[PDB]
Amino acid sequence: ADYDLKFGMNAGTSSNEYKAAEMFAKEVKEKSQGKIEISLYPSSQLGDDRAMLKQLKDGSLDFTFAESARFQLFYPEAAVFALPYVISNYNVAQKALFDTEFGKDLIKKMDKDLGVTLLSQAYNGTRQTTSNRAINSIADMKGLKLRVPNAATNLAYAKYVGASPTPMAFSEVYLALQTNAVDGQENPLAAVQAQKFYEVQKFLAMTNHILNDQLYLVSNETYKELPEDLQKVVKDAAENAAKYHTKLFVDGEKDLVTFFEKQGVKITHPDLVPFKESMKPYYAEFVKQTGQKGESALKQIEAINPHHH
Ligand SMILES: O=C(O)[C@]1(O)C[C@H](O)[C@@H](O)[C@H]([C@H](O)[C@H](O)CO)O1
């Protein structure tokens, strides 16, 4: 309570994100000897992630989550993190952010231009596609009214596989699916579980199309005001929570398919070759729009070996 701080997020109280944010909050309170208390504001109470990023910049929110890909809003080449099928796995996502010149520069700009400090990175699952009718092949996407978040890379995913995208906020999705205003949505399995989308979607297709990370972000206005020993408490707690965050996602990912089958969901495994083929002209458009910066980021990312060594 010397520092009453706030951590906003789109995820809800049943989510892995929230569980790991609770761990972070508990560690910070303990190790700051009570000087800092972090309260959680889930379910987009404060707005969406675009809004919460603005609040961190302004200093009116202290902590939030965002993907590396979400920074495409300021630096177009950062969409590389969510070009479908480009990032192979989380090992690549980690090296793309921390071990490339592109990623290192992005982190610096976040701090210097956007007033946000990157404390840690976790894995947030690989997106799959749920729907009210089977997706047995890419043909089934044609005219599927597929909800997407308000993000260019997801809108593109939907466009290029032949679906009819409808952007809407995460908070509005469950109702849209339940009323069949849309036919499907796409998110990692842990979100399908957390938001109970499986109650209102009969089918799950393993499209494996976009890999999400999650960054623990702090407003510079807040971080700069903490004495350095408290900065260290926050940084160390964010790193500890991110490892736990990743583990919740990794441990659950395979098992969740069983969980959904038991809830009555039918699982399909469409041939992904035509999905990946369909993205070829999108990668071309990305390079055309983002220029040499985008080409360079793609090359640095494609150079990363996806196997742990
Ligand atoms: O609305 C969604 O389905 C969601 O997955 C919810 C999740 O909490 C959020 O981090 C992401 C993110 O906003 C997009 O992937 C664009 O970066 O969107």
Side-chain angles (χ1 to χ4, degrees):
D2 288 354
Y3 301 93
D4 288 325
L5 304 183
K6 301 179 197 171
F7 192 145
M9 64 189 82
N10 284 332
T13 60
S14 299
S15 71
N16 292 335
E17 293 97 314
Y18 184 90
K19 289 184 175 68
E22 280 182 310
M23 169 183 170
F24 173 66
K26 171 165 164 80
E27 180 177 341
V28 168
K29 188 181 189 187
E30 298 183 338
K31 291 190 184 165
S32 69
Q33 329 257 69
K35 277 164 171 290
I36 299 171
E37 291 188 358
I38 300 174
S39 296
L40 307 186
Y41 291 82
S43 290
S44 297
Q45 284 176 36
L46 306 182
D48 67 353
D49 53 338
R50 298 174 296 172
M52 284 183 281
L53 283 172
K54 177 188 178 297
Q55 295 158 218
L56 258 65
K57 177 155 168 42
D58 291 329
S60 59
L61 179 54
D62 310 291
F63 298 97
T64 200
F65 285 131
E67 301 162 1
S68 291
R70 201 35 146 170
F71 291 84
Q72 71 182 274
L73 292 168
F74 314 105
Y75 311 111
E77 60 275 12
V80 300
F81 284 107
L83 295 168
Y85 311 107
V86 169
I87 300 271
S88 295
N89 61 18
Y90 185 56
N91 177 47
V92 169
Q94 293 179 297
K95 295 175 167 176
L97 177 62
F98 295 104
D99 298 328
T100 67
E101 291 304 310
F102 155 69
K104 288 186 223 156
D105 174 73
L106 172 61
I107 299 172
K108 284 173 183 132
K109 281 185 301 195
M110 289 164 46
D111 177 6
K112 268 61 220 198
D113 298 1
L114 304 180
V116 319
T117 290
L118 170 50
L119 298 169
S120 65
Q121 172 191 50
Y123 178 53
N124 218 73
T126 299
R127 302 178 82 88
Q128 311 294 355
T129 303
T130 64
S131 54
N132 61 11
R133 62 183 167 78
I135 297 173
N136 300 125
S137 72
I138 194 164
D140 291 307
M141 303 296 305
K142 193 73 173 188
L144 182 76
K145 293 180 168 190
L146 176 60
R147 175 276 174 170
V148 292
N150 289 301
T153 31
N154 307 70
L155 276 161
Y157 164 65
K159 160 182 185 161
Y160 285 91
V161 298
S164 300
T166 290
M168 77 184 63
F170 192 53
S171 62
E172 308 310 292
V173 178
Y174 183 98
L175 178 62
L177 302 174
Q178 181 171 234
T179 62
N180 292 300
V182 296
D183 298 322
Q185 62 75 59
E186 48 78 53
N187 257 113
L189 300 184
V192 173
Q193 177 191 209
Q195 291 291 118
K196 301 248 253 296
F197 297 152
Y198 62 90
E199 291 178 337
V200 290
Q201 297 278 263
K202 181 163 200 237
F203 299 88
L204 161 64
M206 300 304 283
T207 56
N208 292 304
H209 55 279
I210 285 171
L211 179 317
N212 291 327
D213 71 349
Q214 204 86 344
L215 304 177
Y216 282 68
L217 299 178
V218 64
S219 174
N220 282 7
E221 300 291 311
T222 301
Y223 199 55
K224 279 22 234 262
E225 94 195 351
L226 293 176
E228 181 272 349
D229 57 309
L230 295 186
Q231 293 174 337
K232 182 186 191 303
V233 161
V234 168
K235 175 62 176 188
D236 290 344
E239 294 280 21
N240 291 332
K243 290 174 180 309
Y244 172 63
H245 189 135
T246 289
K247 182 194 204 330
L248 291 170
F249 276 92
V250 165
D251 288 349
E253 220 157 31
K254 274 310 231 192
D255 294 343
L256 281 167
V257 174
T258 307
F259 170 82
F260 295 127
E261 285 178 324
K262 173 161 145 192
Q263 294 299 311
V265 183
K266 171 52 146 80
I267 311 309
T268 62
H269 299 266
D271 172 11
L272 298 183
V273 169
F275 287 71
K276 297 180 183 177
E277 291 178 331
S278 74
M279 295 301 135
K280 288 194 162 141
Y282 176 38
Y283 304 151
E285 178 73 16
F286 168 80
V287 162
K288 185 192 183 182
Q289 298 313 307
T290 65
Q292 289 190 300
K293 274 170 170 195
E295 278 184 286
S296 174
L298 251 189
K299 275 143 226 46
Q300 290 170 54
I301 289 177
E302 285 164 343
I304 304 170
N305 191 85
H307 180 43
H308 74 274
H309 288 288

Coordinates of all heavy atoms in Angstrom, one line a residue, residues 10-11 17 49 65-67 69-70 72 124 127 147 149-151 154 168-170 173 185-188 191 212 214, ligand 1:
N10 N -7.1 -9.0 -20.4 CA -8.3 -9.4 -21.1 C -8.8 -10.7 -20.5 O -9.9 -11.0 -20.5 CB -8.0 -9.7 -22.6 CG -7.9 -8.4 -23.3 OD1 -8.5 -7.4 -23.0 ND2 -7.2 -8.5 -24.5
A11 N -7.8 -11.6 -20.1 CA -8.1 -12.9 -19.6 C -9.0 -12.9 -18.3 O -8.9 -11.9 -17.6 CB -6.9 -13.8 -19.4
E17 N -3.4 -17.1 -17.5 CA -2.8 -15.7 -17.3 C -3.1 -15.2 -15.9 O -2.2 -14.6 -15.3 CB -3.4 -14.7 -18.4 CG -3.0 -15.0 -19.8 CD -4.1 -15.9 -20.6 OE1 -4.6 -16.9 -20.0 OE2 -4.4 -15.5 -21.7
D49 N -6.8 -4.8 -24.8 CA -5.3 -4.7 -24.6 C -4.8 -3.5 -25.3 O -3.8 -3.0 -24.8 CB -4.5 -6.0 -25.1 CG -4.9 -6.5 -26.5 OD1 -6.0 -6.1 -27.0 OD2 -4.1 -7.2 -27.1
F65 N -0.7 -7.3 -19.7 CA -0.2 -8.3 -20.7 C -0.3 -7.8 -22.1 O -1.3 -7.2 -22.4 CB -1.0 -9.6 -20.6 CG -0.7 -10.4 -19.3 CD1 -1.7 -10.9 -18.5 CD2 0.7 -10.8 -19.1 CE1 -1.4 -11.8 -17.4 CE2 0.9 -11.7 -17.9 CZ -0.1 -12.1 -17.1
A66 N 0.7 -8.2 -22.9 CA 0.4 -8.1 -24.4 C 1.3 -9.0 -25.1 O 2.4 -9.4 -24.7 CB 0.7 -6.6 -24.9
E67 N 0.9 -9.5 -26.3 CA 1.8 -10.2 -27.2 C 2.8 -9.4 -27.8 O 2.6 -8.2 -28.1 CB 1.0 -10.8 -28.3 CG -0.1 -11.8 -27.8 CD -1.1 -12.0 -28.9 OE1 -1.0 -11.5 -30.0 OE2 -2.1 -12.8 -28.6
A69 N 3.4 -9.7 -30.9 CA 2.8 -9.3 -32.2 C 1.9 -8.1 -32.1 O 1.7 -7.4 -33.1 CB 1.9 -10.5 -32.6
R70 N 1.4 -7.7 -30.9 CA 0.5 -6.6 -30.7 C 1.2 -5.3 -31.0 O 0.6 -4.3 -31.3 CB -0.1 -6.6 -29.3 CG -1.4 -5.9 -29.0 CD -2.4 -6.0 -30.2 NE -3.7 -6.0 -29.7 CZ -4.8 -5.9 -30.5 NH1 -4.6 -5.7 -31.8 NH2 -6.0 -6.0 -29.9
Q72 N 2.8 -4.6 -33.6 CA 2.6 -4.3 -35.0 C 1.8 -3.0 -35.1 O 1.9 -2.3 -36.1 CB 1.9 -5.4 -35.7 CG 0.4 -5.6 -35.3 CD -0.1 -6.8 -36.1 OE1 -0.6 -6.7 -37.2 NE2 -0.1 -8.0 -35.4
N124 N 1.8 -18.4 -24.5 CA 0.4 -18.3 -24.2 C -0.5 -19.2 -25.1 O -1.7 -18.9 -25.3 CB 0.0 -16.8 -24.4 CG -1.1 -16.4 -23.3 OD1 -0.8 -16.2 -22.1 ND2 -2.4 -16.2 -23.8
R127 N -2.9 -21.0 -31.3 CA -4.3 -20.8 -31.7 C -4.8 -22.0 -32.6 O -4.1 -22.4 -33.5 CB -4.5 -19.5 -32.3 CG -4.0 -18.4 -31.4 CD -4.2 -17.0 -32.1 NE -5.5 -16.4 -32.0 CZ -6.0 -15.7 -30.9 NH1 -5.2 -15.4 -29.9 NH2 -7.2 -15.2 -30.9
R147 N -15.1 -15.3 -36.1 CA -14.8 -14.2 -35.3 C -13.2 -14.1 -35.2 O -12.6 -15.1 -35.1 CB -15.4 -14.3 -33.9 CG -14.9 -13.1 -32.9 CD -13.6 -13.5 -32.3 NE -13.0 -12.4 -31.5 CZ -12.0 -12.5 -30.7 NH1 -11.4 -13.6 -30.6 NH2 -11.6 -11.4 -29.9
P149 N -10.0 -11.4 -33.3 CA -9.8 -10.1 -32.5 C -9.5 -9.0 -33.5 O -9.4 -9.2 -34.7 CB -8.5 -10.5 -31.7 CG -7.8 -11.5 -32.5 CD -8.9 -12.3 -33.2
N150 N -9.5 -7.8 -32.9 CA -9.2 -6.6 -33.7 C -7.7 -6.5 -34.0 O -7.0 -5.6 -33.3 CB -9.7 -5.4 -32.8 CG -11.3 -5.3 -32.8 OD1 -11.9 -5.2 -33.9 ND2 -11.9 -5.3 -31.6
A151 N -7.2 -7.3 -34.8 CA -5.8 -7.4 -35.1 C -5.6 -7.8 -36.5 O -6.3 -8.8 -37.0 CB -5.1 -8.4 -34.1
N154 N -4.7 -11.6 -37.5 CA -5.8 -12.6 -37.4 C -6.8 -12.3 -38.5 O -7.4 -13.3 -39.0 CB -6.5 -12.5 -36.0 CG -5.6 -12.6 -34.9 OD1 -4.8 -11.7 -34.6 ND2 -5.6 -13.8 -34.2
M168 N -14.2 -8.6 -33.3 CA -14.9 -8.2 -32.1 C -14.0 -8.4 -30.9 O -13.1 -9.3 -30.9 CB -16.2 -8.9 -32.0 CG -16.2 -10.3 -31.5 SD -17.8 -11.1 -31.4 CE -18.3 -11.1 -33.1
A169 N -14.3 -7.7 -29.9 CA -13.6 -7.8 -28.6 C -13.7 -9.2 -28.0 O -14.8 -9.8 -28.2 CB -14.0 -6.7 -27.6
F170 N -12.7 -9.7 -27.3 CA -12.7 -10.9 -26.6 C -13.9 -11.1 -25.7 O -14.6 -12.2 -25.7 CB -11.4 -11.0 -25.8 CG -11.1 -12.4 -25.2 CD1 -11.0 -13.5 -26.1 CD2 -10.7 -12.6 -23.9 CE1 -10.6 -14.8 -25.5 CE2 -10.4 -13.9 -23.3 CZ -10.3 -15.0 -24.2
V173 N -17.2 -12.5 -27.4 CA -17.1 -13.7 -28.2 C -18.2 -14.8 -27.8 O -18.9 -15.3 -28.6 CB -15.7 -14.2 -28.2 CG1 -15.7 -15.6 -29.1 CG2 -14.8 -13.2 -28.9
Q185 N -14.5 -19.2 -33.9 CA -13.5 -18.3 -33.4 C -12.2 -19.0 -33.4 O -12.1 -20.2 -33.7 CB -13.9 -17.7 -32.0 CG -14.0 -18.7 -30.9 CD -12.6 -19.1 -30.4 OE1 -11.8 -18.3 -30.0 NE2 -12.3 -20.4 -30.4
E186 N -11.1 -18.3 -33.0 CA -9.8 -19.0 -33.0 C -9.0 -18.4 -31.8 O -9.0 -17.2 -31.6 CB -9.1 -18.8 -34.4 CG -9.1 -17.4 -35.0 CD -8.0 -16.5 -34.4 OE1 -6.8 -16.9 -34.3 OE2 -8.4 -15.4 -34.0
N187 N -8.5 -19.3 -31.1 CA -7.7 -18.9 -29.8 C -7.0 -20.2 -29.4 O -7.4 -21.3 -29.9 CB -8.7 -18.6 -28.7 CG -8.9 -17.1 -28.4 OD1 -10.0 -16.5 -28.7 ND2 -7.8 -16.5 -28.0
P188 N -6.1 -20.1 -28.5 CA -5.5 -21.4 -28.0 C -6.4 -22.2 -27.2 O -7.5 -21.7 -26.7 CB -4.3 -20.8 -27.1 CG -4.0 -19.4 -27.6 CD -5.5 -18.9 -27.9
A191 N -7.6 -20.9 -23.7 CA -8.7 -19.9 -23.8 C -10.1 -20.5 -24.1 O -11.1 -20.0 -23.5 CB -8.3 -18.7 -24.8
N212 N 1.0 -17.7 -29.8 CA 1.0 -16.5 -29.0 C 2.1 -16.6 -27.9 O 2.1 -17.7 -27.1 CB -0.4 -16.3 -28.3 CG -1.5 -15.9 -29.3 OD1 -1.2 -15.2 -30.4 ND2 -2.6 -16.3 -29.0
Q214 N 3.4 -14.0 -24.4 CA 2.7 -13.1 -23.6 C 3.8 -12.3 -22.8 O 4.7 -12.9 -22.2 CB 1.7 -13.8 -22.6 CG 0.6 -12.8 -22.1 CD -0.6 -12.7 -23.1 OE1 -0.5 -13.1 -24.3 NE2 -1.6 -12.2 -22.6
Ligands
LIG1 O1 -9.4 -11.6 -28.3 C1 -8.8 -12.7 -28.4 O2 -9.1 -13.7 -29.0 C2 -7.4 -12.8 -27.6 O3 -6.8 -14.0 -27.9 C3 -7.6 -12.6 -26.1 C4 -6.2 -12.5 -25.5 O4 -6.3 -12.2 -24.1 C5 -5.4 -11.3 -26.2 O5 -4.1 -11.2 -25.6 C6 -5.3 -11.6 -27.7 C7 -4.7 -10.5 -28.5 O6 -5.4 -9.2 -28.3 C8 -4.7 -10.9 -30.0 O7 -4.1 -12.1 -30.2 C9 -4.1 -9.8 -30.9 O8 -2.7 -9.5 -30.5 O9 -6.7 -11.8 -28.2

